[model samples]
Target: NAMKKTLILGATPETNRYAYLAAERLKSHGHEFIPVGRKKGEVLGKTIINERPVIEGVDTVTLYINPQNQLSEYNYILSLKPKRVIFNPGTENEELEEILSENGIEPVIGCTLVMLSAGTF
Candidate 1:
């Protein structure tokens, strides 16, 4: 299968973060991505964009933001119209998943890194 363009919501390139590792791997594997987050930083030479504008051409969205922080942007995320949303570990939200599913978007509750590593993403 062709690699999908992934949106890394709440991305950070900190050495101890899974999102950073995922970003590294994704880039190494030749997958396209648009990293969004509250912080201003670059990941793998790409500037991480602020989470204000709606990102387009997102085949998959992998969230790294927690539930408490996620409340204000559920609708915004749904508006992106990605084929699937991956709720990485510690980021699962059933209510949001249902909302996305109701809108005809697939919600995947799993680790993006794990899925990618195992070739299931």
Candidate 2:
């Protein structure tokens, strides 16, 4: 099982958004994901947990929210203790990146879609 159990922090049902497409791509690639978002809906046959619940063994946390909106959830994010957190383009925040670094968690400022496309994910 090389599949990563990635927690998608901004998952939604909107077809146009990357959060939605990322779920689909994750499914296509056979990776397991926990959909966490503001919206209460299902994506790829999985229930969307609207809040940040304490999940264990999370390999990656792919964030889709903006840096401003990400402020309050810092503690919750750190709690997951993911191996790496994908900042995903506009979501880059140096403050959080430093925090993750100090905690020994990798902070990656990259596009999840592109990484998946290039086989570098």
Candidate 3:
């Protein structure tokens, strides 16, 4: 599979979080991911950094944080300029949705798990 390098926001060490589950599946599928969170910890094989570095080659970003928390990440996310942003479940926000569209970032309101299972992620 030609996997897009993904950035997983709100990543955590807890197994119960969907972000962790998504990381595991994405890893097993040979897809690479970076974990970003406020907590100082690691998820999967990467460090959970508190910073959103303006890195290169991040084609996709799957969100685990909610709309409210996303308010702070507005500029950072757009700076990444991902080809697409997956607003998994409760992460959808009309405010950010508009901005994403304006920036040419495709906003997908869907479950990352389902997409992974269906081989679309």
Candidate 4:
């Protein structure tokens, strides 16, 4: 199987965080990930990049941050050139979805954990 690189925005190792759970699921499925967040921590032994650098070759970007807090990196996210961006549940925003679509990027509004569990991601 080909490895799909996913970027976990707002990633952290906190047990209650969806980002952490998504990272765990991605790891179990053998997917590669580059985690980014404001928190300083590690997930599955991979250090999280809090500074949020421009990442390339990303197949998917799983958003863990809410729209209100997403403004800062909105342009940066779009610049990554990911094939798709998953707006997991509470993170959905129609405006951003349209923006991503306009850029020729697939905007997915769903649960990344569930999608991965069902082998649909």
Candidate 5:
């Protein structure tokens, strides 16, 4: 099983949304996931935590929020100490990537859903 213990940033319970889809897909693929976002709700049986709670052993964090809204989360994201951060589609941010790399975390500029589907995640 490709269990990454991923954290779905910008996660939501809304159907058809990429964040929700990613969480669902992760579940189907046997990857453990923590739903995290500004919204308070449940997705794929996991609660969408509104605050950036300190979590240990987070392997991957996939972004759904765009660059404009991502700046404020930089510190919080880094605090998780994830191995990689996936900047999905419109969420790509060069500044955040640079910072992540500088801090020794891999900054992945790609779609989490696509990677999982392609067996590359």
Candidate 6:
């Protein structure tokens, strides 16, 4: 997974967030990642980009936003062209999962932190 970029959706500056924990895990491993959310901020020295960039090869997107809140980002998610997207508990959306499958993007329903913890991600 060298050079693979994991885009953290719905990231927050708050340390209590799972996105923040995920970023810590990624950083501890020295992996590449980008934290993007609705508000611009910084976490762990990496600037949390408020919007998606046209990143060419995102390997994974760990979602922290709720399903209802996710509707607005369908196209935005697709634009990432990530090989897989993690729904991460409360963020699961069947409609989005269907669309993701249709587009050949693997949908994973699990906790980003847990998956990393179990080393099964």
**Residue 56 Cα positional deviation in candidate 3, in Å, after optimal superposition:** 0.7
Tell me the lDDT of candidate 5: 0.90
lDDT tens digits by residue: candidate 1, 36-118? 88878898888898756887788998899998888987887888899999999999999989999999999998887788778
- Order the candidates by lDDT, highest first: 5, 2, 4, 3, 1, 6
Where model 1 places Cα greater than 4 Å from the true spot, the runs are none
How high is each candidate's TM-score?
0.94, 0.95, 0.95, 0.95, 0.96, 0.92
Put down candidate 5 lDDT per residue, 59-112, tens digits, no spaces.
Answer: 999999989989899998899999999999999899999999999999998888
- Candidate 1: clashing pairs of residues: none
Candidate 2, residues 1-121: lDDT per residue as tens digits?
3689999988888889899888888878888988997888888888899877899999999999999988987898899999999999789999999999999999998888888888877
Q: Give the number of colliding residue pairs in candidate 6.
A: 0
lDDT of 3: 0.88
Local accuracy of candidate 3 as per-residue lDDT tens digits, 85-111 = 999988889989899999899999888
Off by over 4 Å in 3: none
* Least accurate 10 contiguous residues by lDDT in model 4: 68-77
On TM-score, the candidate that comes out on top is: 5
Per-candidate clash tally: 0, 0, 0, 0, 0, 0
Model 6 TM-score is 0.92
Query: Which of candidates 1 and 2 is the stronger one according to lDDT?
Result: 2
Give the worst 10-residue stretch by lDDT in candidate 5: 1-10
Weakest lDDT window of 10 consecutive positions for candidate 3: 38-47
Better of 1 and 3 by lDDT: 3
After best superposition, candidate 1 residue 78: deviation in angstroms? 1.4
